[PDB]
Design a protein around this nucleic acid. Structure first.
Ligand code: GTA
Ligand code: MG
Ligand code: MG
Lengths: 729, 724, 146
RNA sequence: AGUAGUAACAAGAG
RNA sequence: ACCUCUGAAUAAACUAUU
RNA sequence: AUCUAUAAUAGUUUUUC
């Protein structure tokens, strides 16, 4: 009634009637932003200039009745001058600080409810626990982290639609909530906010603070969850780490993810030790995940993962030999596999490397709405027997099975602009990208998969590409049907065998992906970086060599065997490719032996660079190496044997060794350093004498030096665009 | 001992002390008078870079236009705009061949954007050159004036609310024989009726001015403000260029901050890994000389034509309009000049519109030469500028062109033992060259330089250098085996921002936290920064501690509030309370940080929704850096300079606009939360909403039949008033 | 020449509503004249369907108070969806997946009106397959009296 | 005079 | 001369916050 | 595992003779 009377009043005036008639709803936004021009260019200067004025602050005209014109000292609090383009009056800051001491008082009891997020921050800081401060060689990595967690199974647009449904039911337009998560959250918030006495706009902003996810790229070390990101300034520094645990309640999915990350790191590190089982146990007892001991989490966490199950089995716990893939819990009833990287060409003409599992295997798929039995061979689906609930559940199960099968048809079914790198050029998991692509639109995948006639066995139905229950022909190898932890023993080499004696898990089955933890992973031992990421592992390994250079040098001179067997090099050896560990070790050991027998050719930097590669059991081959590869976030990063490298660059001007762009420390020149330009640790069986010498014909390559014999000097294009004279001993 | 700070670099690498080389504690240089000299210099230089091109007279505006496309191949290393169209088309073709489907998918996304974008997208921005007033206006004000003029001239396709319909209206306005406007003077309204050529000259005109507060430049430079007619087309072209750039690994746009640094580092490391160990690698820290004064709108039209192959005709047309309008663009000369008589002790303003036929005795030698060079180009008070992209426009399309030139450096294209790749962001670039020896490096650099010359890109020799790969500079980011911190760049952000007390406190603490996270701001320096910010905040807002005797006008009130308070820690710093911030709680709003330390009555007064300084409820007025609104979230006064001009009716008009908008919000509660959409008028929408709501209330029994009948009677009265 | 006939025959209110409806989606009544005539006829049919009907105090249909039908055609998508959402919330009726033409209070259902130049059955089947709802009532007319 | 630097301020408008 | 008014908003991308 | 909400404000970056 008041609204319609005010509208009738505005329609009676000539100008307001013109505005109301000639302005459409679309142009209402334009006229709402319409202004004469707020000449604001330097707000800091403008504020400093205005705070010297008598009345720099505007206020509503009610202040002339709510606040007196003058205070006790007679100072004026407001003036009758109106602000430009409005009926607001000009007031002094004295008016605001007078209100804060003499104004009417209301009940501020609903403020903690309306601003629950900020008071939640206050509570998390209040009940948080601070640990010691450790000064370390920090290696921060720019990654996408969430600063506002929002709701788990929601996006920004879905959260906005849910908010509109909850707060403005009659303004939702054509949107209908389809996701079951949206319906559940909508019902929950409608019941919780029933008979609420807050303004609807304020309620909408509360729900935005509560439900809308926000992620950003930040240079982050430690946990990437919101509770750790909000205190990232406090907990992480350039040279220090502050141990801290937020005081609130920790989400369990973050615990699961961090446990998976820690277990994978621990298992991969333990695989290279002499006794993997003891190393795994002592690492699991020394690991904390968000202020909680890892062993307790393992005892009370039902997470289906290979490394987590290996960690459980090492401690006598019962495991479920299962894993997750695309929202389903797989379990290998029978079969075996060996991973193998195979490059494939996508349907949209993209080249990528996919970890292909060889061998024949059988699986069972379990999901919240569907169940299936899967048999497969190398990149070939033998059969799939789905027994889902509705059409969409069976469709999702079929899509997941097709992606899992790694069928070349599935690869060639890719269309559109499907990206396999991050927006920051970070490599993504190809299988996850294929899943997300085919879960948006799978018509082309089903079309190109094929068809196959069914023989009507047991009455199991067929399925057509458009999701219909045919009885004559079905998708190739797909059939439709209708609707436990075990005690294990773990070997010395982390081989998990069932009570009967069959192998269930192995270290080779552990994923090679190097992820990051949602909750900060604290490791307490001599090497706090022993289960850290590859960048931290490399930097800290070379810094450990630098700091201990005196006794390491003495041991290298006297007893190299014990030096190569230091436990500190094992995290490094977990980065060297498994097939090349022995070759690199043997090559580097031969280089070191030649370096010892040729006095004066003592290059400190060469020894420091090549030492971590000698920690593996040596395999003797005649292959020459110009560079050694190290896996860093999936890409083999080479360390060039001669000269600097992206991983390892030594600066002679500063005497400062920089690894992956992180300072590792300054070396000190040895008296036995060779100030003569003679190198003996570059070629396996050839000693560098000097620069180019045209007397010995044209320059050749390192990979063609076998034909040379004893004393045959030659010129080799070893290194980055350099030719030097080498001789054979 | 003479103190030499520069000798610090003898031990600290320059990248690790790069903050010392940015003197960003003093005031930046400013421009004092006119920008006409710089604008004329830019026009003359742009035409000089293309002087060997073909001259034509535009049949629609009469402006002389210089066409450097397919001009003679240069024989020297001077800058030139003689880009070859076939070379640009071939670069586009090879870019499409190395990334199959990039243009098709980008066109699909851009078609969706074009079909869905609303007209109020044009209000996003500060100023738009209003052709109806021959000066800059706020973007919303310029759009409103343009829409009103179009409606008065029977151009009402924009009533759909879509941006493309507004562009159709612009195109239709181009064909009107006469466009009518309205002018004010000392305050009556006068109608002015432009002719076809006059309106066409106004619509193709970009305003010009000087750039104030620019760091690192000895001399001032000109900048441009696009008009209302071209903004939508530029938005659509930039949307297409953005779609293309998102799919390119070498692009430096549109990624910024830590994401940009991570992408650049990953791309550089991928280039290093792909490089063979037995080959040299060099990186070029490269700049381009006068990129925007040498690139031609005709080449951008060619690029858009190649990109939109096999697309619907309407999409190609709507994308092509922007380069076409940009190749016929005119430039406002600016304010003009001021003339000083020493003997008679007088000064006077000379408008730029008189420079066409003004006596040249007044001007000095350099300005006289500028005017003599530019007079043939002057038409209708503006200068004909066919070549060049004016200033800060089509940056992502420039990025696309640069990335295509970078992409030309694969071994499949060089067909030799050298190859190149690198990074591209608008005009800035970094280039990595690999070759078996130094001769190959030289050959690859030469080939890159000559290819850029072919497509009209001139590599600044005096601002570029080359060294072994591992250190470079790109878009002011300094890479030394990884991007280093640069604190001096964010140093001006520290201080009182000037919104209000609450917002400024939040900004100070948030800036300290962000610089701790990103720019390697240490904890001790963070505490000292907090102390300095608190000191500046207390001095700026006259809110020193209550228990001090700093004599300010506000000190007595703060003393009174301090005396009556029981728990002093609960008072905000704005109220004279103490500073409770430290490193651990930088992320917490002040009102929430000390909420439980406040007196009940003080807290009730501070967070009182019925206070006049901010427009069970809570204080609400656009609450940037203000989590909880208090009485300290006031709004300062607006500038009152408009009251002395003839545009002072805009104040009354915006007051009535705000009144109508608030009345509308009384009918559609979600309008403030999410922008409403609709072709119906405001009164019609409100009446329909009132009728449906009254019917529903009657049906559910919330109101009785008498009130329903009264609402229906008032609605009928409003409908009757609507027609008359 | 269809536009001239459309403006000459149909009354100005329906012509304005059809012009607004076409302009809302970028269509030009001068260019698309067959669509102009179709929309004018559709609006005229809907308004003849709605007018001269009321509801008594009891709540049964009467012919000459509140109108029996709520008109959803002739409004922009925002107001039409506002009406549909508000009616569904206040009555519990299922929300349609597409904008209907009328709401019948007596039958408490949405009505989808259709005027066809072809035979009734093919258009009826097309609309039935399009909406994929068994609750939205469908009523199809024709220019031949079917 | 001074600020300042490729053009201005050293009050402007009514 | 008194008197009266006034102390001055480029583009694009990004980042931060709401 | 993925991850450019929308909008507003401020800040930052983007030079011829
Ligand atoms: O966030 C990461 C991880 O922590 C999270 N995750 C893992 N497990 C869980 C559980 N149990 N609950 C909640 N979240 C979980 O998912 C993310 C995994 O990321 P990433 O490590 O990059 O992927 P991963 O390396 O695990 O590979 P993925 O594609 O997800 O496959 C998982 C699992 O499936 C095995 N596998 C695939 N294929 C095709 C196989 C096959 O043909 N034969 C056999 N025997 N195994 C196959 C993968 O090797 C992994 O073992
Ligand atoms: Mg540069
Ligand atoms: Mg309809």
């Amino acid at each position: 009634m008041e609204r319609i009377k005010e509208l009738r009043d505005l329609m009676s005036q000539s100008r307001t009637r013109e505005i109301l008639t000639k302005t459409t709803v679309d142009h209402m936004a334009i006229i709402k932003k319409y202004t004469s021009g707020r000449q604001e260019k330097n707000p800091a200067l403008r504020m400093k200039w205005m705070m010297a004025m008598k009345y720099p602050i505007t206020a509503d005209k009610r202040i002339m009745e709510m606040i007196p014109e003058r205070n006790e000292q007679g100072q004026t609090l407001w003036s009758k001058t109106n602000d430009a383009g409005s009926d607001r009056v000009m007031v002094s800051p004295l008016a605001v600080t007078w209100w804060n001491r003499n104004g009417p008082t209301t009940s501020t009891v609903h403020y903690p409810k309306v601003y629950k997020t900020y008071f939640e921050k206050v509570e998390r800081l209040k009940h948080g626990t601070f640990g010691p401060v450790h000064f370390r060689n920090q290696v921060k990595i720019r990654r996408r982290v969430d600063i506002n967690p929002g709701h788990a199974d929601l996006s920004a647009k879905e959260a906005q639609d849910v908010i509109m449904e909850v707060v403005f039911p009659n303004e939702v337009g054509a949107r209908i909530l389809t996701s079951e998560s949206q319906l559940t959250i909508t019902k929950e918030k409608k019941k919780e906010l029933q008979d609420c006495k807050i303004a609807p706009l304020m309620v909408a902003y509360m729900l935005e603070r509560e439900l809308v996810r926000k992620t950003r790229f930040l240079p982050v070390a430690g946990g990437t969850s919101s509770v750790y990101i909000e205190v990232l300034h406090l907990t992480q520094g350039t040279c220090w780490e502050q141990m801290y645990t937020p005081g609130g309640e920790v989400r369990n999915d973050d615990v699961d993810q961090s446990l998976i990350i820690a277990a994978r790191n621990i298992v991969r590190r333990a695989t290279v030790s002499a006794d993997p089982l003891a190393s795994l146990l002592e690492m699991c007892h020394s690991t904390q995940i968000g202020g909680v001991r890892m062993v307790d989490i393992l005892r009370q966490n039902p997470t289906e993962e290979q490394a987590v199950d290996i960690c459980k089995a090492a401690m006598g716990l019962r495991i479920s030999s299962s894993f997750s893939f695309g929202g389903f819990t797989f379990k290998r009833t029978s079969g075996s596999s060996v991973k193998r990287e195979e490059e494939v060409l996508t349907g949209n003409l993209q080249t990528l490397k996919i970890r292909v599992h060889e061998g024949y295997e059988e699986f069972t798929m379990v999901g919240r709405r569907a169940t299936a039995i899967l048999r497969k061979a190398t990149r070939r689906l033998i059969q799939l027997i789905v027994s889902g609930k509705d059409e969409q559940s069976i469709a999702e199960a079929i899509i997941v099975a097709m992606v899992f099968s790694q069928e070349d048809c599935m690869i060639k079914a890719v269309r559109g602009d499907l990206n396999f790198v991050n927006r920051a050029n970070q490599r993504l998991n190809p299988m996850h990208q294929l899943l997300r692509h085919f879960q948006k639109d799978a018509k082309v995948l089903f079309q190109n998969w094929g068809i196959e006639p069914i023989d009507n066995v047991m009455g199991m139905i067929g399925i057509l590409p458009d999701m219909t229950p045919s009885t004559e022909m079905s998708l190739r190898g797909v059939r439709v049907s209708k609707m436990e932890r075990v005690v294990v023993s773990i070997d010395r080499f982390l081989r998990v065998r069932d009570q009967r004696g069959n192998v269930l898990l192995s270290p080779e089955e552990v994923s090679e992906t190097q992820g990051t933890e949602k909750l900060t992973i604290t490791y307490s031992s001599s090497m706090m970086w022993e289960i850290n990421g590859p960048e931290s592992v490399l930097v800290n390994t070379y810094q450990w060599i630098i700091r201990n250079w005196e006794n390491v040098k003495i041991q290298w001179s006297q007893d190299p065997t014990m030096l190569y067997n230091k436990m500190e090099f094992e995290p490094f050896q977990s980065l060297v490719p498994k097939a090349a560990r022995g070759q690199y070790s043997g090559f580097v050991r031969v280089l070191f032996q030649q370096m010892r027998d040729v006095l004066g050719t003592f290059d400190t930097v060469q020894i420091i660079k090549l030492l971590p590669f000698a920690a593996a059991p040596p395999e003797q081959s005649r292959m020459q190496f110009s560079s050694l590869t190290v896996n860093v976030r999936g890409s083999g990063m080479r360390i060039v044997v001669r000269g600097n490298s992206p991983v390892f660059n030594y600066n002679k001007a500063t005497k400062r060794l920089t690894v992956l762009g992180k300072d590792a420390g300054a070396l000190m020149e040895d008296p036995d350093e060779g100030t003569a330009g003679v190198e003996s640790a570059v070629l396996r069986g050839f000693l560098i004498l000097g620069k180019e010498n045209k007397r010995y014909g044209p320059a050749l390559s390192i990979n063609e030096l076998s034909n040379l014999a004893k004393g045959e000097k030659a010129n080799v294009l070893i290194g980055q665009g350099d030719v030097v004279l080498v001789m054979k001993r | 001992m003479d103190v030499n700070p520069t000798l610090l670099f003898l031990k600290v690498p320059v990248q690790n002390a790069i903050s010392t080389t940015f003197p960003y504690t003093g005031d930046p240089p400013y421009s004092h008078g006119t920008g006409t000299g710089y604008t004329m210099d830019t026009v003359n230089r742009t035409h000089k870079y293309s002087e060997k091109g073909k001259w034509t007279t535009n049949t629609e505006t009469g402006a002389p236009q210089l066409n450097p496309i397919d001009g003679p191949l240069p024989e020297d290393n001077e800058p030139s705009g003689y880009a070859q169209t076939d070379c640009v088309l071939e670069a586009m073709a090879f870019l499409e061949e190395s990334h199959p489907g990039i243009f098709e998918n980008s066109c699909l996304e851009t078609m969706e954007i074009v079909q869905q974008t609303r007209v109020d997208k044009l209000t996003q921005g500060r100023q738009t050159y209003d052709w109806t007033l021959n000066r800059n206006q706020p973007a919303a004000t310029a759009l409103a004036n343009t829409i009103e003029v179009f409606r008065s001239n029977g151009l009402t396709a924009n009533e759909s609310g879509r941006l493309i319909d507004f562009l159709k209206d612009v195109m239709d306005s181009m064909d009107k024989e006469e466009m009518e406007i309205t002018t004010h003077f000392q305050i009556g309204k006068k109608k002015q009726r432009l002719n076809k050529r006059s309106y066409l000259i106004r619509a193709l005109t970009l305003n010009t001015m000087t750039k104030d507060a620019e760091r690192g430049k000895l001399k001032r430079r000109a900048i441009a403000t696009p008009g209302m007619q071209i903004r939508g087309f530029v938005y659509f072209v930039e949307a297409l260029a953005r779609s293309i750039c998102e799919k390119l690994e070498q692009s430096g746009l549109p990624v910024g901050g830590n994401e940009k640094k991570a992408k650049l580092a990953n791309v550089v490391r991928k280039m290093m890994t792909n490089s063979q160990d037995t080959e040299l690698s060099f990186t070029i820290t490269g700049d381009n000389t006068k990129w925007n004064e040498n690139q031609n709108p005709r080449m951008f039209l060619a690029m858009i034509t190649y990109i939109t192959r096999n697309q619907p005709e309407w999409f190609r047309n709507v994308l092509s309009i922007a380069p076409i309008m940009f190749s016929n663009k005119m430039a406002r000369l600016g304010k003009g000049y001021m003339f000083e008589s020493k003997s008679m002790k007088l000064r006077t303003q000379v408008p730029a519109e008189m420079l066409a036929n003004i006596d040249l005795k007044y001007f000095n030698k350099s300005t006289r030469e500028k005017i003599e060079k530019i007079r043939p180009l002057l038409i209708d008070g503006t200068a004909s500028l066919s070549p060049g992209m004016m200033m800060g426009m089509f940056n992502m399309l420039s990025t696309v062109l640069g990335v295509s030139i970078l992409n030309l450096g694969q071994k499949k294209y060089t067909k030799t033992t050298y190859w190149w790749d690198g990074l591209q962001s608008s005009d800035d670039f970094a280039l990595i060259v690999n070759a078996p020896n130094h001769e190959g490096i030289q050959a690859g650099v030469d080939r890159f330089y000559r290819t850029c010359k072919l497509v009209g890109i001139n590599m600044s020799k005096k601002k570029s250098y080359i060294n072994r790969t591992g250190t470079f500079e790109f878009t002011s980011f300094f890479y030394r085996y990884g991007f280093v911190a640069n604190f001096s760049m964010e140093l001006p952000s520290f201080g009182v921002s000037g919104i209000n007390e609450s917002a400024d406190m939040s900004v100070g603490v948030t800036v300290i936290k962000n610089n701790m996270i990103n720019n390697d701001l240490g904890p001790a320096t963070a505490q000292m920064a907090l102390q300095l910010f608190i000191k500046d905040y207390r001095y700026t807002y006259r809110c020193h501690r209550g228990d001090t005797q700093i004599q300010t006008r506000r000190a007595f009130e703060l003393k009174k509030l301090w005396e009556q308070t029981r728990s002093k820690a609960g008072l905000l710093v704005s109220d004279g309370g103490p500073n409770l911030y430290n490193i651990r709680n930088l992320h917490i709003p002040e009102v929430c940080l000390k909420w439980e330390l406040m007196d009940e009555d003080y807290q009730g007064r501070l967070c009182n929704p019925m206070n006049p300084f901010v427009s069970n409820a809570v204080v609400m007025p656009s609450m940037e850096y203000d989590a909880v609104a208090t009485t300290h979230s006031w709004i300062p006064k607006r500038n009152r300079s408009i009251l002395n001009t003839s545009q002072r009716g805009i104040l009354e008009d915006e007051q009535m606009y705000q009144k109508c908008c608030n009345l509308f919000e009384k009918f559609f509660p979600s309008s403030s939360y999410r922008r409403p959409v609709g072709i119906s008028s405001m009164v019609e929408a409100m009446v329909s909403r009132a009728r449906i709501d009254a019917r529903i209330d009657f049906e559910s029994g919330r109101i009785k039949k008498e009130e329903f009948a009264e609402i229906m009677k008032i609605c009928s009265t409003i409908e009757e008033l609507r027609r008359q | 020449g269809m536009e001239d006939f459309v403006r000459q025959c149909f009354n100005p209110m329906i012509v304005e509503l059809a012009e607004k409806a076409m302009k809302e989606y970028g269509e030009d009544p001068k260019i698309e004249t067959n669509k102009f005539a179709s929309i004018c006829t559709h609006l005229e049919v809907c308004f003849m369907y709605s007018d001269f009907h009321f509801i008594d105090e009891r709540g049964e249909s009467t012919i000459i108070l509140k109108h029996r039908f709520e008109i959803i055609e002739g409004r922009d998508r925002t107001m039409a969806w506002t009406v549909v959402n508000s009616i569904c919330n206040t009555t519990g009726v299922e929300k349609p997946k597409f904008l209907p033409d009328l709401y019948d209070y007596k039958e408490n259902r949405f009505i989808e009106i259709g005027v066809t130049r072809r035979e009734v059955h093919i258009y009826y089947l097309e609309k039935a397959n399009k909406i994929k709802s068994e609750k939205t009532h469908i009523h199809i007319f024709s220019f031949t009296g079917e």
